[PDB]
Amino acid sequence: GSHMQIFVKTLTGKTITLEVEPSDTIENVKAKIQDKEGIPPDQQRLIFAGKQLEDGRTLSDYNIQKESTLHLVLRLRGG
Amino acid sequence: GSRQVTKVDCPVCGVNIPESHINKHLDSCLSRE
Ligand SMILES: [Zn+2]
Numbered sequence: 001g002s003h004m005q006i007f008v009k010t011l012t013g014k015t016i017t018l019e020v021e022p023s024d025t026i027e028n029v030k031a032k033i034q035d036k037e038g039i040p041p042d043q044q045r046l047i048f049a050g051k052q053l054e055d056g057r058t059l060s061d062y063n064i065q066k067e068s069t070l071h072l073v074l075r076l077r078g079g
Numbered sequence: 080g081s082r083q084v085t086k087v088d089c090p091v092c093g094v095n096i097p098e099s100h101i102n103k104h105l106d107s108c109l110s111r112e
Contacts, residue, residue: 014088045105047091050091073090
């Protein structure tokens with residue numbers, strides 16, 4: 001019900017601040033990158049410390065707390 | 080509107096590669112354990 005801020009930084013070096021819970025879910029987080037920069041969860045990919053972030057899991061699962069900085073892989077496969 | 084193949088880093092194995100190959104790299108590189 002609250003909103004915590006996390007820094008999901010693209011391979012283009014741009015930082016996307018989301019407003020979700022650490023105990024929310026990764027599926028939600030990636031939907032929120034789409035809510036910020038306007039790129040869908042298909043064309044972006046979530047990775048922290050070299051591990052891929054699975055949709056069904058949470059930030060807290062993958063050792064990601066609030067205000068953690070992780071990497072975002074742009075694909076732009078749609079064209 | 081960038082008519083070019085984008086060169087970007089693979090955040091798992093830390094290598095700079097084209098973006099088509101970055102995506103494919105991950106599918107191999109995230110396969111852990
Ligand atoms: Zn790789």
